[PDB]
Amino acid sequence: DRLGVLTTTRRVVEQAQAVWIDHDAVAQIAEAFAARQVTPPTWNRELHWSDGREALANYILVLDAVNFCFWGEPRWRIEYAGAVYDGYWALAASLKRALEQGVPLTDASYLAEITRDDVATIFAGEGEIPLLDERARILRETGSVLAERFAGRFSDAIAAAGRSAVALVDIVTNAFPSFRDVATYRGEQVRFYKRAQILVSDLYGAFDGSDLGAFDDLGELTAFADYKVPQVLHHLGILRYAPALHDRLARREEIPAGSPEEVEIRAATIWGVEELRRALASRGHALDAYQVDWLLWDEGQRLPAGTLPYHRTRTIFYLE
Ligand SMILES: Nc1nc2c(c(CN[C@H]3C=C[C@H](O)[C@@H]3O)cn2[C@@H]2O[C@H](CO)[C@@H](O)[C@H]2O)c(=O)[nH]1
What we know:
By secondary structure, this protein is mainly α. The protein is built from 14 helices and 6 strands. The strands form 3 sheets. A two-stranded antiparallel ribbon has the order 1-6. β4 and β5 (188-191) form a beta hairpin. The protein is globular. The site of the ligand Nc1nc2c(c(CN[C@H]3C=C[C@H](O)[C@@H]3O)cn2[C@@H]2O[C@H](CO)[C@@H](O)[C@H]2O)c(=O)[nH]1 has 21 residues, from α4, α10, α11 and α14. The site of ligand QEO has 21 residues, from α4, α10, α11 and α14. The PDB classes it as hydrolase.
């Protein structure tokens, strides 16, 4: 456990007061998923952009740099190629739309200099992308670190990982402050690394496990502690919420980032996915944790209305 995500989240799950895993539900979900041999959707090529290996690598870095927090009213929606998109697909469609119109979002020089007005246009639609100014600051940070550290080529960073998914997460969090996804719980550091781990899996997806997306240790990635996978784990009965937390999610009351309740949901999401992976594997359906994550996240896209709302956390980068 070379990143310490499973080890530190395990401490949270064992002590957790608002969140617990129903291991009976895990076994019952495993039985059903293993029977119909469910796999995750193929990495989505319609709404993800593509080009040369150097450009595609920078595109993945940019995509996942700003891959967070799409909720709010009025709902942020985007028009691309005849269809309207919200949430993640709005992020993906907005970047692809921009690049196709010749916006150089793969050029470190441009990224380093990008204005509030530039990213407001890239993400222009109904409402406004949450934390707009924050995404401008991250794209500047991302651009200038690419330029200074890696000759404006994320391929250099990937090359230095030596086809270790875990080594690449560590290289990203070391170099890019905004990818440092840790918290504390009862005075102990909890490590999560949602966006850095997503990034590694998105390279694997984009490059078909070849060239820059080649990794010999993808099994070492955990789930990505977001707000849809826990909502899917709650819907499937795997995650249970205590009264006060349940009522907060139902009332759509925002939950402060790094608060005990938020850290417990995220830690229980990691261990919810890992317990489902173990149970599935025991029933002869061996998947990697990131594959179980993708599968569950896909389920998140078509939950039956009346399902308990996802937790609302404003992703904070107070330590720029
Ligand atoms: N755990 C998890 N979270 C994901 C994703 C994604 C998008 N992933 C795509 C890439 C490969 C998968 O098959 C998906 O189509 C966004 N997100 C996050 O979901 C939330 C709402 O989009 C945000 O917190 C995003 O950062 C995921 O796969 N797993």
